[PDB]
Amino acid sequence: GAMDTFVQHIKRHNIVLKRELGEGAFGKVFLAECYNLCKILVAVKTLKDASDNARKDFHREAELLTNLQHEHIVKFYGVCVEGDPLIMVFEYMKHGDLNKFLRAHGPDAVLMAPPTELTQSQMLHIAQQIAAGMVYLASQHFVHRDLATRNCLVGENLLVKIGDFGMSRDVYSTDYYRVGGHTMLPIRWMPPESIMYRKFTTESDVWSLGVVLWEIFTYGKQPWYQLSNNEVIECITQGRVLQRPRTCPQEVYELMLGCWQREPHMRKNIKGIHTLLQNLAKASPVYLDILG
Numbered sequence: 001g002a003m004d005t006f007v008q009h010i011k012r013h014n015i016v017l018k019r020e021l022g023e024g025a026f027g028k029v030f031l032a033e034c035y036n037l038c039k040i041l042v043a044v045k046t047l048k049d050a051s052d053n054a055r056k057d058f059h060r061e062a063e064l065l066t067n068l069q070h071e072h073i074v075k076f077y078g079v080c081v082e083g084d085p086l087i088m089v090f091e092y093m094k095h096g097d098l099n100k101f102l103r104a105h106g107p108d109a110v111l112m113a114p115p116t117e118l119t120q121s122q123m124l125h126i127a128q129q130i131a132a133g134m135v136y137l138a139s140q141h142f143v144h145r146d147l148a149t150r151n152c153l154v155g156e157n158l159l160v161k162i163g164d165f166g167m168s169r170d171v172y173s174t175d176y177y178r179v180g181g182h183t184m185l186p187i188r189w190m191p192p193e194s195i196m197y198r199k200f201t202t203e204s205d206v207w208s209l210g211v212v213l214w215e216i217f218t219y220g221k222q223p224w225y226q227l228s229n230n231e232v233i234e235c236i237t238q239g240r241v242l243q244r245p246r247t248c249p250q251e252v253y254e255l256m257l258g259c260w261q262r263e264p265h266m267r268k269n270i271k272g273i274h275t276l277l278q279n280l281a282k283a284s285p286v287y288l289d290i291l292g
């Protein structure tokens, strides 16, 4: 509602730092315990001894994320500005990132162990949740710019939420390329206009969703894995498309092809993508036991 426009402020004594999860763009990331919020586990981002403009950006980021509230968007609880460091509060997703989850439930993982192989029904349930979250972001005129399974988070009962880590993860360093020798960009999830002209829109996010769908149906495999970064851009710019995954239905692959149109405004709309995925997920629901 309208109250979400105003940033929720949390008292310092209510945050109990437990584990240093890593380091990001503006500071450290921690696993913490938050009391009198509604105790719950939280993923917190810190900003230590920063300038007036950097603290201004922190409050600006807080003002953006406070209004960005949805069932399939990682919950932003608020900020703690009482002293240094400045704390940004998000929910802690126990099961971690979606890419790690997809790989843990892949045919190789089942064979190397025992976890259950991720079914087509479970794949459709994951797909419709990300599509629902993307529908919300488009309605709020927000361009994600980095939509990938590594940026999605898994909760309880196959619950999937979209996030943007902004944290240095060495395991995903190969998923970024220094475009023009200036910006680290996720080329394998990017359309031609984003790689060549750095144009990021709702339509460029649609292309990324098509690639996210490819990731889900391939058990978290890297798109264009057979190719080098140069060959990836060549295929994207020339009009070559990713292969149809074995576990992917023809309706879903044709939807992926609709996301992969060269012209940004010729791509399938997010509402239409979600409606189809929601209908197929309801036709093939999740009922089987999932083991890790």
Ligand SMILES: Nc1ncnc2scc(-c3ccc(NC(=O)Nc4cc(C(F)(F)F)ccc4F)cc3)c12
Binding pocket: 021, 029, 043, 044, 045, 065, 068, 073, 074, 090, 091, 092, 093, 094, 096, 137, 144, 153, 162, 163, 164, 165, 166, 167
């Ligand atoms: N949430 C977690 N649960 C378990 N382990 C970890 S280990 C780290 C995190 C972590 C910390 C902060 C964030 N922040 C985030 O997603 N912010 C954010 C979201 C959006 C979105 F609305 F599009 F999703 C856009 C811009 C953003 F900065 C994500 C993951 C995390």
